[PDB]
Amino acid sequence: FPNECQLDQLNALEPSHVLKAEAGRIEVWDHHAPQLRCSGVSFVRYIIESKGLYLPSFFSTAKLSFVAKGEGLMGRVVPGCAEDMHQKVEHIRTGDTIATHPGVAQWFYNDGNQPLVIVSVLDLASHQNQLDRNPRPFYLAGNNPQGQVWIEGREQQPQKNILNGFTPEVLAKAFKIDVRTAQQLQNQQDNRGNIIRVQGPFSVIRPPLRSETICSARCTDNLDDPSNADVYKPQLGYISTLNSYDLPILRFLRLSALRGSIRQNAMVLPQWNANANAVLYVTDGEAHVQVVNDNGDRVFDGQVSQGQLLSIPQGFSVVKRATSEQFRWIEFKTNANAQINTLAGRTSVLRGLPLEVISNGYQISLEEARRVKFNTIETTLTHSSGP
Amino acid sequence: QQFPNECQLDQLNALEPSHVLKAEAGRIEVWDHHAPQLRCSGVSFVRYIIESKGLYLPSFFSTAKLSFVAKGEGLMGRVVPGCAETRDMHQKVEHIRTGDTIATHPGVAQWFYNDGNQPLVIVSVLDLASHQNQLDRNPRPFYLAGNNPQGQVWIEGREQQPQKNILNGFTPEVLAKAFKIDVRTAQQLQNQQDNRGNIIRVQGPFSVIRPETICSARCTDNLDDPSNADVYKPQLGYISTLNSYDLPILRFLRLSALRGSIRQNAMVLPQWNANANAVLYVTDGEAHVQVVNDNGDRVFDGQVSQGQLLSIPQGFSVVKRATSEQFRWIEFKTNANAQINTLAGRTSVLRGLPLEVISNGYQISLEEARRVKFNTIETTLTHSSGP
Amino acid sequence: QQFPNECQLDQLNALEPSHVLKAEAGRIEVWDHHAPQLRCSGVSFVRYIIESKGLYLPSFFSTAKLSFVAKGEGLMGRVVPGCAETFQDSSVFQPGGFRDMHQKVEHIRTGDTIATHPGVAQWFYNDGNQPLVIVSVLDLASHQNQLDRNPRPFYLAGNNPQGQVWIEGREQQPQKNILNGFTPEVLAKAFKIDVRTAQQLQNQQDNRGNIIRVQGPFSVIRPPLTICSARCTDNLDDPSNADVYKPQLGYISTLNSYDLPILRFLRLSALRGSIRQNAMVLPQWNANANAVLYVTDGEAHVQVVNDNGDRVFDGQVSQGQLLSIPQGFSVVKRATSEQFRWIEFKTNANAQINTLAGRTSVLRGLPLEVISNGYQISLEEARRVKFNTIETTLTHSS
């Protein structure tokens, strides 16, 4: 700072701190990484084991979640909505994107054996974050004996739940419970973490085997659904987006999402986000990508493989070529309506330039300019063979 | 302790003003916005004391302003950019009385006059961190007439210079050429070494009342009416609120307010704002309050009394409890429609939790889980006592 | 001073460029945004000075851009993400013959005011006789800049061997176009062209800079016969579209968002004015915007007063100089040369000016007894201060 975005290297990142819990593990990326600090965001991935519950929490930041693996239940709770009688539970499965306003509590539960992987971007720079430039979870139940290790200056003390901060008597008089039941909720010394294992069953919602001024608004949608893809060249792959126009609640989150499933040796044409920072998380497979900054320098050139995260701040241009049989990723963008501009193909900035600018710009023939401008016939996905 | 970890607060205190500007007919008492706790919120706070017949001379600010008449009565006038000009004719001049909450856009001149016999106390927040403030993380009052000898003692770079009105700024000649007046008269507009300050005694007659696209819609509203409040249990007290729905102009100011009046032992159930930083000011009486971290630490716990400010960042939880005969406060929130979330009661976040989440979460019985979820039937206010 | 007291300013100065990028056929003169005075306003400023036959090559920015053409005439090309191809180009001698499809190439003349979304690429050409001078504000503070407190050109073609000299720790590394950053091979696979040709695209070592001499037939328009097709250009030298037009004194014209709806997204606003010697623009401030003032013609004497009541500028300001005026600072300006002409760029889609003197004065809206008890003057003297000036914004003096 105040040059946070003068980036000379990008590296494909993995988590920095790992909260080990009883039934899975929260894994958090270091938002102090220059590249994340440039993005404005942190990243975290829940890994949830069988019979595991991610206990209710809420954040100071808009959140956008993508369930990368397995399936389960997610539970939302807001102010004023119509709340055994609880607010609505939901079946979540792989490909589902999930939007949360700041201050909204959410829990997740895994029923199966396949681990439930949920992957999330916390938007730190948004005005909606009226605190701080760290990810700040507020736990309603779990105790976190490791403490806030993702936030420096913590000095190695535990992070108890919200209820622990109150005296047990004021709790008692508030909930109308016994002072000893009050203390129970404080989960003092509780070793489990925030992903706890459920004893007995979880008759939360019955899966029927039968089959703003928007509190009714829907906050889930599936991205793996090619019916709704922005592009579908079945031989190459599909890319799918999530706009304000698909979930109105996003206009306010200022957040967006893209899903991509491509096949070995398919190339995503070189592009840049006109109005958003990206953060790209690989779901399945590996691709070879190059990234170019404002100085025309190559800030990244390498494989990006599953579980990894690459930051693509506004204006940086990327080019991706699948290496593995198939490659499936998800990009999170800091704009409720992210715009892409391609540098190649039939909708490229170059394509919209007059030939004569192209020849004089590159000091090349008029015919060569004609080639570079018209040859690549595809819009966003093309073939390619090599390394 | 400071940016960009501005909000890793580990203690709060009841805050009093740190600087008193002394004027002829009253004072202007201003809180320290360098205080970690107030910097975290992005607001400053200032209190006027206008003695009888005193006039707060016209200032405008760089920042949204949300004022509250804590006690007294008097007149007050705005001067919006060239509106309805209704032998003297001048813009609207309204009366104001305790309870009144006044909105001011950046750039709008405001003045106050105590036409009554008891002291006029206006108490008001400045939204520093808002994007409407295109200056500085600083209260920056621009004075139309008031000369102030103590100078900007609330900004760090001052160096003890005196702070003169705007007119003082131009050469008296140009001031003459512009208002089309005698240079003599011009110089007199500059109030050099007028020591009165900004709150002056008026002389003789004060017979004023005589003759985005909103020079019309309302900018004032009274919160001391228990019949237009949100919850009014006469047993306990009332809490009334000023939303953008109430005063549609707040949509722009990004500021809401909340007014509380509760009697002894009345308790305001543990709550947090999902989407607003708050500044609580005690107008009458004394309450005992607790506040909780995202670490689940008690960062406050103690008495907060008349004339004090307690800063409550977004996501911190707060239980209030009247200690005096009657306790009356005013909450200022950085959101044109703040959203409270309750940790206990019929609106609680725990209400909208499936019981098996509550039970497993805190490791308590199902009997215990059904109480913790249901016993408290009240929404916001409640008696300080349990089973 | 410095953040978060970036606006404790005690002295402002008429400013000029602080670095120059000299190109084959023109130069980019860029202002210093690290100047305390410019840092407060949260913007940078730049002037393209384009020679004849001179092409300024396609660049896109990470922030909003509001351009003004101060001197000259020429062509401009915008290119948005995924739009149809408007214009068409005759092919001179046709074999295999094809013409050219491409975005709309507009003509620009002095007074045109252009708007650019972050991510939009633009190039300028001087078909004209004299030098073409475009002047531009870049909105650094705006939420739309996802990057940094610096202006960041992204160059599609031009090489800049001087590098990013306007940013701090660049250490004299050259600045290549975007294409240079990809291996020639991937570029070839992407453009389905020969790897030897992909090398050429990277303009490695090209020392022309970003404004080049166009050799030959720049025949770019042959015969002319939710908002993707909104209006983004407009001419402020057109007095039929002015807020105030006193033809003895001069005019002030304005680009609110009520004129260019796309501005409500850019969070930017403009104000062009022409006044004649000794005309005065009554003391005003901006209620909700930071201003940046550029003189395009002549001289005027201005005073700027801050919130401490001090005079932070009091002097001459002439052609090519820029004066920063933060929200709340109050400004008076008297024309001094035969006629004074200037362009203000405000940091609000719709800017509210508040006058201290005249028919809309802030004082005009005060009760007499506040004016009289305030400055301690005569009730008669108050009647005067409040009413004597009947003009709103413009007036004559000496």
Side-chain angles (χ1 to χ4, degrees), chain C residues 381-395:
Chain C
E381 269 164 330
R383 190 233 160 258
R384 284 163 169 172
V385 181
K386 190 179 162 175
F387 287 113
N388 281 351
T389 296
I390 67 158
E391 38 256 323
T392 273
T393 282
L394 268 197
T395 183

Side-chain angles (χ1 to χ4, degrees), chain B residues 18-168:
Chain B
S18 280
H19 295 281
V20 179
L21 300 166
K22 254 162 154 56
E24 150 172 305
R27 37 197 144 79
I28 293 165
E29 331 211 302
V30 17
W31 277 253
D32 191 329
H33 62 281
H34 305 115
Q37 136 194 349
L38 268 185
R39 206 186 39 242
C40 175
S41 305
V43 279
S44 189
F45 205 76
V46 64
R47 174 210 320 175
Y48 311 170
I49 316 278
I50 329 279
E51 299 146 24
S52 200
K53 211 166 195 264
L55 160 74
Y56 182 112
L57 288 146
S59 66
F60 67 88
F61 296 79
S62 53
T63 56
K65 195 183 151 195
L66 217 209
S67 308
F68 181 86
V69 301
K71 54 192 36 72
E73 156 180 355
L75 300 187
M76 100 99 188
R78 284 187 217 77
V79 176
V80 291
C83 291
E85 193 64 354
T86 172
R87 193 205 297 241
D88 198 22
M89 54 198 168
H90 50 77
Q91 298 208 11
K92 167 191 52 185
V93 179
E94 26 183 302
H95 297 229
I96 59 176
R97 41 155 168 148
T98 285
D100 280 342
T101 299
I102 322 84
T104 324
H105 235 83
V108 170
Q110 259 194 2
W111 57 264
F112 300 75
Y113 173 81
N114 185 201
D115 66 15
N117 311 116
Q118 278 193 316
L120 176 56
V121 167
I122 297 115
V123 104
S124 25
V125 77
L126 314 143
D127 189 1
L128 270 8
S130 175
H131 78 283
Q132 318 199 55
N133 178 29
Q134 299 208 56
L135 262 42
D136 229 6
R137 220 58 145 236
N138 275 289
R140 291 191 166 278
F142 294 77
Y143 291 100
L144 256 21
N147 174 70
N148 163 212
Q150 303 185 224
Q152 314 180 315
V153 300
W154 57 93
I155 317 169
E156 207 75 72
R158 215 354 79 189
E159 304 265 287
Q160 307 201 345
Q161 312 195 342
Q163 169 190 1
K164 11 277 187 289
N165 73 37
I166 299 177
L167 273 0
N168 177 282

Side-chain angles (χ1 to χ4, degrees), chain C residues 300-313:
Chain C
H301 187 92
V302 16
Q303 315 194 59
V304 188
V305 185
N306 63 193
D307 59 316
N308 195 47
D310 294 332
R311 212 185 297 144
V312 292
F313 179 95

Side-chain angles (χ1 to χ4, degrees), chain A residues 1-8 38-39 245 254 267 269-277 290-299 301 313-319 321 334-335 339-341 343-364 366 368 370-378 382-387, chain C residues 3 34 55 57-58 60-63 78-82 85 89-90 98-103 105 118-121 123 143-150 152-158 163-164 167-170 173-184 186-187 189-193 197 200-203 206 208 212-215 217-220 226:
Chain A
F1 195 68
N3 289 312
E4 26 161 311
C5 279
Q6 185 87 330
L7 265 17
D8 289 325
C38 173
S39 272
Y245 304 130
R254 309 219 237 107
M267 171 185 144
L269 285 190
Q271 30 144 210
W272 81 81
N273 297 297
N275 61 335
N277 292 347
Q290 292 174 49
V291 172
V292 174
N293 70 194
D294 53 316
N295 202 39
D297 290 318
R298 183 188 307 152
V299 301
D301 170 323
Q314 172 177 41
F316 281 47
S317 331
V318 191
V319 78
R321 177 185 61 87
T334 58
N335 195 313
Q339 244 65 47
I340 280 141
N341 246 118
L343 293 162
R346 83 157 210 92
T347 47
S348 62
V349 53
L350 265 40
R351 177 62 157 265
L353 256 33
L355 255 202
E356 297 81 11
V357 171
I358 298 187
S359 41
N360 282 287
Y362 299 113
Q363 274 174 337
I364 62 166
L366 230 310
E368 306 186 70
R370 193 231 156 250
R371 312 202 168 119
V372 328
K373 191 194 173 194
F374 297 107
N375 284 192
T376 327
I377 16 200
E378 29 270 301
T382 186
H383 292 258
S384 88
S385 303
Chain C
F3 43 90
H34 301 116
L55 166 57
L57 291 168
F60 72 77
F61 296 81
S62 61
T63 68
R78 232 150 34 217
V79 177
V80 315
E85 281 165 336
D89 262 347
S90 290
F98 80 71
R99 63 273 265 169
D100 189 340
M101 305 161 60
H102 61 64
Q103 289 259 172
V105 168
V120 180
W123 55 265
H143 65 93
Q144 334 174 66
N145 176 30
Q146 223 68 332
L147 270 37
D148 248 359
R149 211 71 171 185
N150 321 259
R152 294 202 192 252
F154 283 79
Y155 288 115
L156 272 39
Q164 325 183 75
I167 311 187
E168 275 175 36
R170 287 280 38 161
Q173 278 178 41
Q175 193 189 25
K176 328 75 168 53
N177 64 46
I178 288 170
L179 279 13
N180 179 256
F182 295 107
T183 57
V186 53
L187 226 47
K189 300 195 196 117
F191 289 99
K192 306 280 180 169
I193 56 169
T197 313
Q200 297 208 248
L201 293 192
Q202 305 185 294
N203 274 332
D206 180 4
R208 286 176 307 170
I212 61 165
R213 189 133 281 120
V214 170
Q215 334 285 178
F218 204 81
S219 28
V220 171
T226 36

Side-chain angles (χ1 to χ4, degrees), chain B residues 247-288:
Chain B
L247 265 194
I249 206 56
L250 302 183
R251 180 178 40 244
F252 310 118
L253 282 63
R254 345 281 289 203
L255 290 176
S256 143
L258 164 155
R259 159 63 146 176
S261 190
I262 70 183
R263 57 199 311 155
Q264 206 155 36
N265 298 288
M267 155 175 139
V268 176
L269 286 170
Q271 72 192 202
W272 85 78
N273 309 286
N275 64 340
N277 276 324
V279 136
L280 181 157
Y281 180 66
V282 175
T283 114
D284 299 303
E286 332 180 19
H288 171 90

